[PDB]
Amino acid sequence: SENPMRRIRIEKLVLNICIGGEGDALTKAAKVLQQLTDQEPTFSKSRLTIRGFGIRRGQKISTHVTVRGEKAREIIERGLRVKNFELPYSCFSTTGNFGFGITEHIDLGIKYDPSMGIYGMDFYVVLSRPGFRVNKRRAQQQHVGASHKITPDEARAWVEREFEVVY
Amino acid sequence: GWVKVQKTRSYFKRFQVQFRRRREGKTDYQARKALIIQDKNKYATPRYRFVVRRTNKDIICQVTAAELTKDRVVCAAYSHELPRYGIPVGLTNYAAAYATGLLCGRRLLEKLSVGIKENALAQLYPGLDKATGEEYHPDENENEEVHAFKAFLDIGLARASTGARVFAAMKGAVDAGLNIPHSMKRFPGYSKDGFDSSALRDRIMGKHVGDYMAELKAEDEETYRKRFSKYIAAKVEPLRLEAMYTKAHAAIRANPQAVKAKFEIKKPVRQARLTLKERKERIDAKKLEALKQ
Amino acid sequence: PDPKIRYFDLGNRRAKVNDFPYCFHLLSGEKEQVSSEALEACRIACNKYIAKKAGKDSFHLRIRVHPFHVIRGTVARVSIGQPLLSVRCRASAKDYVKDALRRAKFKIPGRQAIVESRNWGFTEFTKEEYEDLRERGELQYDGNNAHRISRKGPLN
Amino acid sequence: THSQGYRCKTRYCFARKFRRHGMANLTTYNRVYKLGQYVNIKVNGAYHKGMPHRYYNGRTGTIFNIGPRALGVQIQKRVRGRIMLKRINVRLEHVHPSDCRKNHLERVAANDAARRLAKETGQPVPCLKRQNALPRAAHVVSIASAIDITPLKYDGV
Amino acid sequence: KNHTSKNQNRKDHRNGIKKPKKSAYTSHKGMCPKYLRNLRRSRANDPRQSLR
Amino acid sequence: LNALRIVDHYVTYGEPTVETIRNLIYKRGFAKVNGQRIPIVDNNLIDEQLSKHNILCAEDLVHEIFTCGSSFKEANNFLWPFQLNSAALKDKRNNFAEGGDFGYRGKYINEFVARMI
RNA sequence: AGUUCGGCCAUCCUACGGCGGAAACUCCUUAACUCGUUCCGAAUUAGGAAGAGAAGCGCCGUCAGGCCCCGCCAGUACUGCGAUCGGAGACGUCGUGGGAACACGGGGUGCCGAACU
RNA sequence: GCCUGCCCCUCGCCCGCCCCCCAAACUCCGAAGGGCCGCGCCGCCCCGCCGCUGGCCUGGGCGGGGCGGGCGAAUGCGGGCG
RNA sequence: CGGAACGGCGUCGGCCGGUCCCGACA
RNA sequence: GCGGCGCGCCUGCUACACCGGACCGCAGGCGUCCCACGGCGGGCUCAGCGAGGACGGAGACCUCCCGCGGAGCAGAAGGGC
Structure with a gap:
């Protein structure tokens, strides 16, 4: 509809950098996420111990920040300049939330520092409309309506207008 | 890719629906059980709950007893009644919540005292004449022939924080004279080594909205118009908030009786339910529509 | 030990609903426990006789009873009027089936009953009921069984 | 029965009903009980304190x-x-008020009521004693629509 | 015989199936102390009072 | 009637005729006065224990029993259970419906008791 | 009509599609505070009032699924009691009592009670 | 089948729907059959007492005094205690 | 004559499917 | 006798719908472990499907959805949540 309420918004961007058993790289990956997003990233530990990627239970193998608001738009567009505004058509989920990933933090536009090595990151963007709080609120929590839920096709259209992305 | 639906017929057959108000998300039955439970040796003596529920538009404060098949509302005062007492805007603000609580407490105590005369509950428990951050416990000193009315705060699904507005209505009930047990930890002023009456006094007097109003107007007049359009439209001066609040507290104490306003009822008739023959007729039409492609 | 009989569907298992019209059933006269060895030997005899006299395609044979009760290898609990063996066959095999069932009866313990089935094939519907539904088209076919097209569910 | 613990053979007895697993309705804690009231005892599986024994x-x-x-x-x-x-x-969750003498309480009220009603009008006193069915009266039944019914033939085999 | 319950129900019903006796129903055993103290305080006044 | 069906194997029952009642009350009737078996040979004994119930004479007794009247319990209890001669009994094991003797004999109880009185 | 608190907890649920909203509710709009985010005002805490029914929310629909009710199933399956009943049995029968279930068909699809506008 | 090719087929896998026979240690249902408890004293008014309960002029117990009705399933049979 | 699965054109009693005066090629 | 232990204790059975029922009858446990694996309050949802996201694949990590519990609650089994 042309209802103001049915306007899609970028609810959240998640920047996750998963390294492994090297230990030092994880701390440095957090610092470049802190300087990119401007908020402090948190660390996700391992759920299982696997010898092949040295994964050990509770080894803090990941670092991620949830960026919301105007900051999220700036980071997504800078990442999409690395992708040259081209995304796969199937990179969109059934929920209407899409994602992309880049290698090399320098490609985003961050300046290089010798102490911290280049680390790539995954960019997952969640698309939402005003009125979706009915799923997340503590009191009177009910599922969003199927019409009000973002459809994968309607999400492609929104991003092909906002960032002129071609699929 | 080819997978069974999570919600199978078996899922629905074995599904146990939760309680109607739990499904709605309106009530926590674990909290309610403790708030409603009374000793069996006390039998049917009524147990009162001071329920403070905050809708976006107003703060609803009520005193309710738990009957076996219903809840009885002994008294209920709403923030929407505050314009009659001289508070036109910020009806969901912390200061308004305190005055809504004062209104329910005074309204109930007055209703108990309407005909008693000899030892009226309101006469025996007047309350704090001035709205202050000082901790007041009516139960601390009691007539001993009459005791302060006791009710227990019910916040529902609200998170208990220092400065939360649910506590402000409880302080107004306490200020009116209702004995509501409290610790004053979740009040603006508790700092471990003591209570700063000044900090609570300020929230009760609406200082936080009025300092913001003064700062916002200076920093950006246009945002002040957008943020506080109703205040500018109600001709409420920012500094005047404390005077308005003190006058309101006095106006509540002098006459807490409900105006008992009544309005029109507008009910849309909506669609009439289809008759069984009408449903059967739709089935014939649906079969005919599918038959020709 | 494993039951000697692992195959309970023999003959034309994939045959169509109207491919076979006449069904014959070998029921149990007495309540008894029938061995897996007894079900394997009766299953070899009946299948072989009809397949020899007619064709494997001409008949679908089902050993309805299954040996589950381990005996402290395994035995099948059977009751009076519980079908032990069943066969649906076309006219080409109608005559041979009754005599094959009588060659399977000498292997199974206790009294046994050979009956023609008024029901069409393995379907619940009787031959007359099957025909009436078939003319209407209400008799939707599923695999080898037959069912009513039903007035339940979403119309579209 | 080699082992005899407090909760043995309680698989079905102390198990909730098909769609009744969950927290006790608040009515159990809101029902007034008075001394001498008859109360049925039925265990609730969810509550493990104040639980009576399977005998109870x-x-x-x-x-x-x-x-x-x-x-x-x-x-x-x-x-x-x-x-x-x-x-x-026994904790409230496993004690439910019993109708039990509810029939007798109704009878005592009804017998007294039908006594006063008579004192006013319909003066002959009504019979306030239960009669255990008794034999049927003679009556008359029309056999105009009588249908002959006959044993049916065997068809099973 | 390791165990027999035969004849046990004939022996029980020979002179048995006996009621628990009166003064067991109105016993104060297991009644709340605070209620029992209140009963004694109330009883010790006027007609119920049995002291001089 | 529900209790009687539990004990059917041990008993035979039927509706009695007035002559069958008269013969039992007169020829085999004995009272229960002071827990003693006192023979009913006169209308005086019946008057003594049943005047309160208005059962003054033997005709009142064979009438109350037959009509199952208001004073049926008193009338029946006044009579010590009848002691009779040995029954013919075709078969004690089966019900009269199955061709034996136990259970409902209906009108045939009158014939069954006749020889026993 | 709607709100708050409830009662019993699906005839109240689940899916999907319509239909509304004066008021109310909600979504909503912001962080000066208060408070809150393994990170994030998403939730939450506060302060609002520029918008809006698009959702949540009521109302209707759907040969819908479930749930509810009544028939049929079926006096069937079982079983209480009596049998110098039949039968080699293991199973059945008769007399006298009780009495399902799954299918299947036909419908229905929350109400109650306090306060307030 | 073919520069290759997944260019297509065949069964699996996997969902959908039927379907044969099931269970002492399975149960959405659910008997017969058993168990427990009740079947005479009520209704109404008043008053007394309590370190016990309530915001109260509230309860809950335990008594006393009235005023109206009363024996209110069948059958048998005196029960109890040391 | 305790007795089984199986046999019996022993003697009776039924149940069902048929063909008989279109004599059950002349 | 040899061996085992219905030689103390516990769960589901056999056990015949109150309760009580034997078995060198059956499938199993116990003699420990934890100052947290305790108490309480607040917040939260679990296992997983599906569909998605540089390395990264069957597999970690981050995402939304829908999630009657299909997870977890020290150890047997049954209840319970």
């Missing part, structure tokens, strides 16, 4: 003691050749 399930008793959280109820348990008054304390 299905028993009806009088409330000897009412206490802050559990009511003391006295049942009669036949131990060999003697019935013994077994006083047990």
